[PDB]
Amino acid sequence: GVILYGPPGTGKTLLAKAVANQTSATFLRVVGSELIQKYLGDGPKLVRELFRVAEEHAPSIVFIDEIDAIGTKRYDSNSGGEREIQRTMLELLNQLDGFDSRGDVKVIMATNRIETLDPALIRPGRIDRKIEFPLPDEKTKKRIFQIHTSRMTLADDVTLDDLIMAKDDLSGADIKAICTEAGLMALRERRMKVTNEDFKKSKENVLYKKQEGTPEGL
Amino acid sequence: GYDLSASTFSPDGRVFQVEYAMKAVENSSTAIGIRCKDGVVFGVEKLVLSKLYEEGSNKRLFNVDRHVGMAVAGLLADARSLADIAREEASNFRSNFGYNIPLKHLADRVAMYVHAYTLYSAVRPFGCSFMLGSYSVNDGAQLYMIDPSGVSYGYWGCAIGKARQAAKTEIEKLQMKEMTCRDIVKEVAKIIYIVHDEVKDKAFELELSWVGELTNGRHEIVPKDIREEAEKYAKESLK
């Protein structure tokens, strides 16, 4: 199996969807928050049935997005739904590698936060490959900007290089939001083309969502 | 988690840490003490954990003062610490006021010292019960007992340890208010043998002490000859 880990907004789900659409096998997607059921045993039953209808469908790919919800360090001293989440994780562990042969099923997992997962959950025999997704640096940024502005008429004054040059830890999701908001505000102003000032103001608005404390930690 | 410190009340108003301390006292071998007209007599069921121990080892009878005795049950280490405290209180009283400490006052001072250890989380309750006995012509025979909670009362015959209930039943038939120390010593030995469980515990040694007119008001170990007579009487009684 493969686990995709990286900071939030780098393209884990994007790559999973791309392989899903480009592959010839039954692709199944489940978000970890959907395995936190409200009745005892239903999380384990859901994982059991998810892997049950994955051998019934020939080659298959089971992509459990946001595993961090169900998988965790597994601290014994906890009470409440933590025990049920742990039992769901144990059932998933057994399905991934246990007494029975797994047939022909491939597992993909994505997690913004991999350090809090269970070593038993991401041990080699369970997940072999571990792919790191880094934040775009200098030219991947230009590529995403072009890709997301492809179907959008732009005026001949767009300094995309000026937009990307800043070392603002910008993410691909941030770039997509920038493009969408720039288009939206052009539409609001009634214009027929997006302007460099529109892009700059959209970028400033997007980066306004930072928060935190300045002196703290630095 | 209401029973993890002595500085927290339970929902119903109980200090479980103190209660557990008494529970430890309830696992020790029984020790009894009977007050009579002439004086006071103490007796202890000392189990022989190993045959390699010397006779008199881990003695559970102490002389806190030249006129005051002390019998203990429970954790021995805590008991010895309290005996040192009682000696300190008795010595300090004589230096300050110039005469032997009354037994009632000595019991009160030690009880308050014990009670001070059931109010804070920085210390734990003494896991031991003990009894103080003395005799003076002016005050007569006096016997007291103190528990982990720090409560002290006067008694005519007291028991502490494993077989507290059985010993109390036996003590009820003695009619100690009009008996002498010589006769009481035999009775104290008899009771200890009856309450003891030979099936459970392997063997025990009987430790005896007394204080009264016959000893001139000084607590001391019972003479070997008298102890031998008392042991023979108790064994003969157990037909």
Binding site: - | P11, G13, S149, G150, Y153
Partner: protein, 240 residues
């Protein structure tokens, strides 16, 4: 109503509603002893009466007592945990002696209750130690105020009183005394002892004999605190 957040139930820190659960438990501990006491103020006397339970003949009944003499003219009765009450009695004696040494006259009953209340209040504010689970009632004759009866509790509340109870049947005794207090005077004679003994006898349904209660009184004519002997108690019991 009973929400909890953190250690409000383990130490003396405010509950979400603004409660001190540990203080409340100290009140609940006062009823562990199983005893009840009553104090009633007369026209020119004060009387305190409490139960006396000797579980077996082996106990020396003489030492089993809940009435104490704080000073020559002040006496008290304690309820709740035995060890806690004795420690508070020692502190009251020390405080009264200190007052006499420092200011040159005997400590008024209200001031003694106030001093003990202040000491208790420290326990409920500081988290290092639990509150004493015991209650004190003080009786004495004031120079220009007649008889006095005061009561202080674990929290530090120390209001004065005309009639009072404490223990298992505090509620029933309080109602009984209030009814009597409402009628004419809650007794206005040295036979105020009869009112107290009747109040205690009524709630517990005991029909006391001479060796099941202890009485302590102070009178204007004889301000010294005294403990009535079993003979005198029997005389009052037969009269009623």
């Amino acid at each position: 109503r009973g929400s909890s957040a953190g250690f409000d139930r383990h130490i003396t820190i405010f509950s979400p509603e603004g409660r001190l659960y540990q203080v409340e438990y100290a009140f609940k501990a006062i009823n562990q002893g199983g005893l009840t006491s009553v104090a009633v103020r007369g026209k020119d006397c004060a009387v305190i009466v409490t139960q006396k339970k000797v579980p077996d003949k082996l106990l020396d009944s003489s030492t089993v007592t809940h009435l104490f003499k704080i000073t020559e003219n002040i006496g008290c009765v304690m309820t709740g945990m035995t060890a806690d009450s004795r420690s508070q009695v020692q502190r009251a004696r020390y405080e009264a002696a200190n007052w006499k040494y420092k200011y040159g006259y005997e400590i008024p009953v209200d001031m003694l209750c106030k001093r003990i209340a202040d000491i208790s209040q420290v326990y409920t504010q500081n988290a290092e130690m639990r509150p004493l689970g015991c209650c004190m009632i003080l009786i004495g004759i004031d120079e220009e105020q007649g008889p006095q009866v005061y009561k202080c509790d674990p929290a530090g509340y120390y209001c004065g009183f005309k009639a009072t109870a404490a223990g298992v049947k505090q509620t029933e005794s309080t109602s009984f005394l209030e009814k009597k207090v409402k009628k004419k005077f809650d007794w206005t004679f040295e036979q105020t002892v009869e009112t107290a003994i009747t109040c205690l006898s009524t709630v517990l349904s005991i029909d006391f004999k001479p060796s099941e209660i202890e009485v302590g009184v102070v009178t204007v004519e004889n301000p010294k605190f005294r403990i009535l002997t079993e003979a005198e108690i029997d005389a009052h019991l037969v009269a009623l």
